[PDB]
Amino acid sequence: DNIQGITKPAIRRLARRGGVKRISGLIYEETRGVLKVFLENVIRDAVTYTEHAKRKTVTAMDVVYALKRQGRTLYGFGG
Amino acid sequence: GIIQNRSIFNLFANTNIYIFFRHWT
Amino acid sequence: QAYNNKAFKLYTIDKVTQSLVKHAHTLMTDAKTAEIMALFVKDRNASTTSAKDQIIYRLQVRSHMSNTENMFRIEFDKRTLHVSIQYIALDDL
Amino acid sequence: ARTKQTARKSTGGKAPRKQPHRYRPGTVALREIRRYQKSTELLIRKLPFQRLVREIAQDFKTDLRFQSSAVMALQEASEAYLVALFEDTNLAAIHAKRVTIMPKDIQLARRIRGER
Amino acid sequence: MVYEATPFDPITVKPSDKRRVAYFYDADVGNYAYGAGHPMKPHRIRMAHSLIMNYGLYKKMEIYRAKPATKQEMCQFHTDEYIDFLSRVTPDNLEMFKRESVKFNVGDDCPVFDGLYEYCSISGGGSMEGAARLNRGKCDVAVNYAGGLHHAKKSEASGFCYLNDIVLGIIELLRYHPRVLYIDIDVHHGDGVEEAFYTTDRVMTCSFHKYGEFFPGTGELRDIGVGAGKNYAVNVPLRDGIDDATYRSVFEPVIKKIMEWYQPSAVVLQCGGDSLSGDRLGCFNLSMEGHANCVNYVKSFGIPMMVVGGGGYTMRNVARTWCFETGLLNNVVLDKDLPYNEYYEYYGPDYKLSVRPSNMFNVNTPEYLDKVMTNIFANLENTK
Ligand SMILES: [Zn+2]
């Protein structure tokens, strides 16, 4: 249900930034699952890294570190 | 009508001294 | 634990004392407020006063502040320290 | 005779118990294409996003606090991922003589992207 | 000019009012449990009883195990079909009784546990044998905490109550006593007992209950009985958080006026522990002294009484107040230091007998209770 927190108008805003002019209605709920599985990949690696530092808290450094692994580097948050 | 050796004393005040006295009470 | 929850009103003693301190601070440092307490000082220090002194003290207090403010008559009686407070907001005008 | 139960209540009365100018469709849409393209702020309300991360990280490790900058890193990364995926989808749609992204248009994009 | 604000006097026994006390306890009552998430627990009965044995109160009283009631004896008040359903329903064959589940209000808020019939039989047998021992003169006070099911009615189960044992006890009392007064200090209204004896003048049902949007909703002050039972059902509506002094100054004048006006021959006292402070469902602010002062005051009249324990959904508080009330009936005041029982871990952190009241607002104003007691006293003028 925290997933349903990613609301429609928010997915519409992402589509607008993405240049989409008419969003199907069945897209909204497809974008959730795709979103989840992706976050569920970064955050997984974010935590492997976390439990390697024996740290219990995660860091933004570990987040961009997990992105570097996945492939999609993120500049602006360290490293 | 002179009241010598008075015992009842009156304090006239605005909201500031009234609220201060209410906090004291 | 000590008072069997009968001392719950003392839970905010620091905040209420802080608010009393703040009210005293704005009590001396406000225009049209400290001279009212000065008039109270002159009325309390100078005893043996008749009624006419009390009314002229009342209008002299009234003339210090605005015409829409509220007056309060905080009566004190030495015998019994009994403070009667009376609401005369826009009544003596 | 097939039967089913829907009340789902062995007893009734459970509560009483002891226990005007209007633009054409698309003009406003293109206007706020321009608005959300000239802009750089973050489009998925934060709190909701942070929560998405708490309930989903919970699985990999309990009691995992997240540095604030981190959930902001997850947001940025997620919005970048979805805006890239949505540019691709619009293309996967404008391909099929159309102007409406549809689920199928994104199950495909991701196949060509190879993210599946 | 009827209600008087009086501070709560300390509880003092009367040495000239020694009563033969009969205790009815069946060791099995506690081995029954309404459910997993359910507030009503028969396990409160045996930790109350464990406090009786470990205080050495069994040397001043006789402990009896009442014979459990059969099917018919339950049908002295309830219908045949309701007792037949109660004696046959189990959690296994709940789907075999679906019409009767909604007919007799059994299944939600009155769940089906597989010792239901035995629990009801123990409760009804305890109440009826206490009344019978009162009838023959074998005892002056009959104590039975196994019952108290005052919400059960003729053909339904309500308020965690299935068998209205109090009606069975008052029925057994009526065979030898002309007038029986029922006093309910449970925070809920005694709707089953009042409804059973609504139209008769032989039973006066007095209930000191919270009356708001609270269960069971019945118990308005205007409910005074119909027919020959008019002005023979006193309802005392109370608000939240009534303390010991307020409850005493309400209870003692009303019960005194009933005593010198209705003049009963037997008394049934429902000692619901949900009138205590800190209860799961109750909303009163009575300490154990405040709860037991009603029992001590009704003991002063000398009328042969039946002390029957009813509600109470926090087990520790109801057990402690039942032990104190039982000790009060033997003309002793138990010391506020609990002896070692097998359930000693419940009564933390002080491990004393006392139930401490909460510091919540006694919203029962003197004017409201004055009007309530004035109308109650006016209705009681026709009961001579
Ligand atoms: Zn009750």
Q: Which residues of C touch E359 (CB under 8 A)?
A: 4-6, 8
Q: Choosing from E150, E151, E188, E291, which is the catalytic residue?
A: E151
In the numeric block, which tokens belong to residue E79? 């219908």
Region for residue E206 given its phi and psi (left: phi exceeds 0; alpha: psi -120 to 50; beta: otherwise): beta
DSSP, residue by residue, D30-95: HHHHHHHHH--S--S-HHHHHHHHHHHHTTT-SS-EE-HHHHHHHHHHHHHHHHHHHHHHHHHHHT
| Nearest CA among E56, E52, E34 for reference residue E43 | E34
- What's the CA gap between E191 and E214, in Å, rounded? 12
Tokens of D13: 């009365």
Q: Omega into E349 within 30° of 0, i.e. cis?
A: yes
CB under 8 Å to A68, separation ≥6 — which residues? A79
Alpha carbon of D2: minimum distance to chain E alpha carbons (Å)? 15
Task: Give this entry's resolution in angstroms.
Answer: 3.1
Distance CA C53, CA C40 (A): 12
What b/e readout covers E84-101, taking b as 16+ CB neighbours within 10 angstroms? ebbeebeeeeeeebeebb
Pairing of the two strands E233-238 and B8-13: unpaired
Joined tokens for residue B10: 């009156």
How many domains are contained in chain A?
A: 1
Q: Which residues of D21-58 are buried (b: 16+ CB within 10 A; e: fewer)?
A: eeeeeeeebeeebeebeeeeeebbeeeebbbbbeebbe
Please, which residues have CB within 8 angstroms of residue E109's CB and are 6 or more apart in sequence?
D11, D14, D17, D18, D19, E158, E159, E160
Q: Are E357 and E245 in contact (CB under 8 A)?
A: no
Examine chains E and D and say if they touch (3+ CB pairs below 8 A): yes
Q: Is E160 left (phi over 0), alpha (psi -120 to 50) or beta?
A: left
The total number of structural domains that make up chain D: 1
Cα–Cα distance between A41 and E360 in angstroms, integer? 52
In a domain, D95, yes or no: yes
* End-to-end CA, chain A: 34
Secondary-structure breakdown of chain B: helix, strand, coil percentages, each rounded to the nearest 5: 40, 25, 35
Q: Is residue E87 a contact partner of residue E117, using CB atoms and an 8 Å limit? A: yes
Chain D 19-58, CB below 8 Å of chain A: which residues? Answer: 26, 29-30, 32-33, 35-37, 39, 43-45, 48-49, 51-57
Mutate to test the interface with A, among D86, D87, D98, D111 (most CBs of A within 10 A): D86
Instruction: Answer yes or no: are the C-beta atoms of A44 and D54 closer than 8 Å.
Output: no
Contact E158, E171 (CB under 8 A): no
Is the Cα torsion angle D99, D101, D105, D109 positive or negative in sign?
positive
- C4 near B CB under 8 A: no
Residues forming a β-bridge with C84: C75
Angle formed by the axes of helices A8-17 and D27-38, nearest 10°:
80
Altogether, the residues listed in chain D come to a count of: 116
- Which candidate from D9, D12, D18 shows the least CB-CB separation from E160? D18
Beta pairing, strands E180-184 & E233-238: unpaired
Q: d(Cα E326, Cα E330) in Å, to the nearest integer? A: 7
Contact between A54 and A71 (Cβ < 8 Å): no
Bridge partners of C77, per DSSP, are B8
Residue E217 DSSP code:
-
**Residue-by-residue DSSP string for A14-75:** HHHHTT-S-B-TTTHHHHHHHHHHHHHHHHHHHHHHHTTTT-SEE-HHHHHHHHHHHT----
Query: 3-class SS at E300?
Result: coil
Backbone angles phi, psi at E280, to 5 degrees: -70, -40
E3 in Cβ contact with E370 (< 8 Å): yes
E122 CA from centroid of ligand 1 (Å): 19
* CB contact at 8 A, E277 and E35: no
Q: Which domain holds residue A33?
A: 1-77
Domain that holds residue D63: 20-116
> B13 and C58 in contact by Cβ < 8 A?
no
E236 and E209 Cβ atoms separated by less than 8 Å: yes
Q: Where are the domains of chain E?
A: 21-384
3-state secondary structure C46-71: CCCCCHHHHHHHHHHHHCCCCCCCCC
Angle between helices A28-50 and A60-70 (to 10 degrees): 110
Query: Which method was it determined by?
Result: cryo-EM
The torsion angles phi and psi of E47, rounded to 5 degrees, stand at -75, -30
Q: State the CATH number of the domain containing residue A25.
A: 1.10.20.10
Query: Considering only CA atoms, which of E72, E191, E50, E135 is closest in space to residue E306?
Result: E135
E141: enclosing H helix or E strand: strand E141-144
CB spacing of D10 vs E215 below 8 angstroms: no
Q: In the annotation, is E151 catalytic?
A: yes
Query: How does A42-57 read in b/e, with b if 16+ C-beta sit within 10 Å?
Result: bbbbbbebbeeeeeee
Nearest to D10 among E107, E216, E281 (CB): E107
* Answer CATH for E21-384 from 3.40.50.720, 3.40.800.20, 3.20.190.10, 2.60.40.1180: 3.40.800.20
- Closest of E171, E206, E227 to residue E377, by C-alpha: E206
Taking alpha carbons only, the member of E123, E184, E164, E160 closest to residue E41 is: E160
